[PDB]
Design a protein around this nucleic acid. Structure first.
Ligand SMILES: Nc1nc2c(ncn2[C@H]2CC[C@@H](COP(=O)(O)OP(=O)(O)OP(=O)(O)O)O2)c(=O)[nH]1
Length: 549
DNA sequence: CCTGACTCG
DNA sequence: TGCGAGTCAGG
């Protein structure tokens, strides 16, 4: 733990080498419009700390950041790229991202800072971010010499760790996954996050006003039916009303008490009408709390845009997630909630929203590898069965007899015996190897799969059945986004990606480009990979996200 | 902060 | 006793 570096007062030529480890430090978890608090550069010529005020106003440094021929190794280059966009600076030339490298090597390690990645290779000449900045109300940027040393140590670690990580990825056949898929995707997600999605706040606020009135009415109806006021949003208080006051059957308990889950309340409808009202209330209350109030809280007022963060190194299957706000769980399944999407509008006048979704991509992937309310329920049966639902679960979902449920499942595998063999085989392989893989060589380790405990082992077995299929579908749409943006640029279209929702891409564009997108977007998505079955994509466009159906 | 609710693929 | 996610109010 003894490391020389220069705390620089100005940028010099030797800091602008054609290969460097670069650290552009943003301390806040949400990096949109967040302060850059320090910069570090490590290259052949040495180690350097720079003050942001200095470096980011220096024309040669800004030029270097933006020069794609000056290669930078980083950790979480998307965080830096976006933070720099908010500072009006383009970052190009990122050739290695240690966060994504660590994630591919083992998504279970949950690597979220350089220190945690460093530990994978017994590197310890660097501290955890939390140890440096502290947490919660105590979180603060430390004294410059302490900050400077930390950033340098992080850069130095990225510098030394690149080779060992690349070598391990190659040994796993994951080097191309990193360099040709995840890393190019990171720059594309950076663009999407910075672009944001415009919100119609006038419409959203009016929806909220009307929703409050409706909640009040439903609320009073429930109190009338129950014969008492109580907090409906407390499962504990609700349980007392349902199972003690009204004396309804107790169908399920959890560790804290009586279950009031939606599945349970639906099953209680033959006993008391109040349960349907409560389900409605809890639906409405989530709309109001999360998709009206919560969404308005994160709208940037001057532009009316919301800027999500797509976490690229979180899920265990290779999917993305979306936070603050989550734009991947906006309501669509019931018309009442679906109307929320009318509030998501194009960012320019005379533009339109365009949405394209793969149809049953996971089921097509499985076929390749293995060789309205009714239809909504039928989807859960299809995915449920292939992913290992039991007769109990299926019976409970269709409210049918366990005997009947067992016959459906038997008959299902009768129709698709190759799916059956595959699921048996993939489980045995996971037990032998200790991991499963996707089409593009993404990996998930499953060390619980030989467990002597039934529950623990069974969960791992079902991960073996599910992760390769869900993860392959993730691999595919990731490749489609890369291929799609290349085509957009090639044709000089103004259209651009706004969102990915697992098997869906959401774009905005001038109305004039709608005809071209109707051909281009589905073509690119369908051709991202060639399976033994065709990939099918549906697409629609309209004045709001709601109308793009 | 955890649990159980509602939300999506 | 299908799987992958995030946010919220209540306690
Ligand atoms: N993608 C996916 N969806 C699941 C899973 N489990 C339940 N579902 C539900 C929620 C979303 C829905 C998926 O829709 P699909 O793409 O399979 O079918 P679709 O015919 O294309 O949908 P649509 O009615 O819009 O045309 O099924 C799962 O493991 N993966």
């Amino acid at each position: 733990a003894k490391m020389a570096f220069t705390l620089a007062d100005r940028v010099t030529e030797e800091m602008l080498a054609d290969k460097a480890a670069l650290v552009v430090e943003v301390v806040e978890e949400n990096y949109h419009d967040a302060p850059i608090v320090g910069i570090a550069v490590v290259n052949e010529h040495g180690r350097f700390f720079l003050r942001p005020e200095t470096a980011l106003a220096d024309p040669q440094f800004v030029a270097w950041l933006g020069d794609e021929t000056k290669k930078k190794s980083m950790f979480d280059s998307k965080r830096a790229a976006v933070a720099l966009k908010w500072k009006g600076i383009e970052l190009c030339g990122v050739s290695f991202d240690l966060l994504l490298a660590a994630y591919l090597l083992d998504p279970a390690q949950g690597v979220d800072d350089v220190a945690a990645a460093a530990k994978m290779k017994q590197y310890e000449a660097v501290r955890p971010d939390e140890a440096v900045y502290g947490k919660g109300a105590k979180r603060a940027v430390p004294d410059e010499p302490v900050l400077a040393e930390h950033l340098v140590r992080k850069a130095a670690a990225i510098w030394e760790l690149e080779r060992p990580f690349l070598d391990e990825l190659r040994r796993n056949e994951q080097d191309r996954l990193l360099v040709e898929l995840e890393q190019p995707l990171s720059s594309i997600l950076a663009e999407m996050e910075f672009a944001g999605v415009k919100v119609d706040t006038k419409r959203l606020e009016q929806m909220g006003k009307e929703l409050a009135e409706q909640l009040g009415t439903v609320e009073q109806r429930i109190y009338e039916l129950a014969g008492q006021e109580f907090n409906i949003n407390s499962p504990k208080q609700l349980g007392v009303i349902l199972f003690e006051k009204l004396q309804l059957p107790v169908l399920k308990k959890t560790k804290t008490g009586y279950s009031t889950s939606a599945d349970v309340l639906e099953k209680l409808a033959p006993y008391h009408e109040i349960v349907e009202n409560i389900l409605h209330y809890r639906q409405l209350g989530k709309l109001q709390s999360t998709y009206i109030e919560g969404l308005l809280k994160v709208v940037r007022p001057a532009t009316k845009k919301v800027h999500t963060i797509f976490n690229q190194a979180l899920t265990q299957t290779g999917r993305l997630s979306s936070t603050e706000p989550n734009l991947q769980n906006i309501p669509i399944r019931l018309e009442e909630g679906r109307k929320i999407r009318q509030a998501f509008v194009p960012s320019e006048s005379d533009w339109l929203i365009f949405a394209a979704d793969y149809s049953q991509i996971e089921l097509r992937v499985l076929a390749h590898i293995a060789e309205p309310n009714m239809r909504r329920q039928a989807k859960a049966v299809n995915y449920g069965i292939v992913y290992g639902i039991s007769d109990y679960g299926l019976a409970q979902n269709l409210n049918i007899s366990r005997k009947e449920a067992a016959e459906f499942i038997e008959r299902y595998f009768e129709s698709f015996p190759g799916v059956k063999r595959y699921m048996e085989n993939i489980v045995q392989e996971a037990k032998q190897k200790g991991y499963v893989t996707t089409l593009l060589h993404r990996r998930r380790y499953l060390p619980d799969i030989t467990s002597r405990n039934f529950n623990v082992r069974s969960f791992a077995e079902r991960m073996a059945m599910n992760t390769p299929i869900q993860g392959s579908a993730a691999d595919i749409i990731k490749k489609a986004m890369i291929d799609l943006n290349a085509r957009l640029k090639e044709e000089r279209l103004q259209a651009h990606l706004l969102l990915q929702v697992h098997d869906e891409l959401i774009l905005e564009a001038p109305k004039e480009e709608m005809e071209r997108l109707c051909r281009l977007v589905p073509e690119v998505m369908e051709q991202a990979v060639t399976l033994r079955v065709p990939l099918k994509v549906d697409y629609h466009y309209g004045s709001t996200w709601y109308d793009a159906k």
